Symmetry: D2
């Protein structure tokens, strides 16, 4: 009855909609292209492990986009960008 | 000058466009990149042509996670057709190197 | 916040603007789904969208929703034995 | 019945998805991975193919608009309004 929408566990659940640049629905869309909204008829909960993996993947996506902007702007700024912080183990 | 396109490291690089025998992967790397960043990489685009091992592992990890989330969605959407509630899924392992 | 000028974030027009945040999927979610661009109030980029860009986001999002409905109905056929009928395409605004 | 459009299920005006390339456009707009032999319909109608082209060109314009906005503080060149993509000729 109460499961994680993403891995179907019953353990360590909380609301997807319970309160970062991006809310968890935005993160889920960015990483999996799954649409979630309150009252969509699908499970409304996520386990801690799935929540932390969404946050980890989303920080990866943010780093990739920062790398892309700095590389593209390098011919305008002339400042070669230093290595970025990789997001570490969830 | 020779850096990871994604984290800008100089360490542990390989070509984005070569098969990497060190990482068991489940889809081609340009597709994995596109899924997360919407960046369409190609040989000769003028951008760094390399990726570090950790960025390759992260791309594979995000793809495996997406595949589990989609399996969960299919099983949940099919439940009203049979009334058999789907069991917890076997989670994808974090990808590791070699 | 020099980028926070009064244009459409997506086509740079000054005409027929409203807030991206003006009260299913909200427009920020649609933008993410179609372009992978993160928008939030105070992100330092333009906070407005023209009517035409808003309709194009809604049109592309309805296309994505139709593609997903087709996939769900196709994957149900081996369970139900009912072949799904053709879906209504969204028409360009 | 047998050959339908993967995306709208029509039997009309079909061609192969296979032979930007259309697989890339499909991933770019819907995050669906299609490949020959995936077990799913391998055809697309003209209208769905044109909708993918139109959504891909919109996404391209949004990306170009972001790059042009982000370079403005570095150069002082304010970008003028962009030519929106028109629905492509049949
Ligand atoms: Zn979970
Ligand atoms: Zn890297
Ligand atoms: Zn606009
Ligand atoms: Zn179609």
């Amino acid at each position: 009855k109460r499961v994680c929408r993403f891995c179907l566990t019953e353990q360590k659940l909380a609301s997807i909609f319970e309160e970062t640049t991006a809310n968890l629905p935005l993160q889920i869309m960015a990483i999996t292209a799954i649409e979630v909204y309150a009252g969509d008829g699908m499970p409304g909960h996520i386990c801690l492990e799935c929540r932390l993996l969404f946050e980890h993947c989303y920080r990866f996506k943010q780093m990739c986009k920062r790398a892309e902007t700095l590389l593209r702007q390098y011919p305008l700024t002339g400042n070669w960008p230093s290595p970025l912080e990789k997001p570490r183990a969830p």
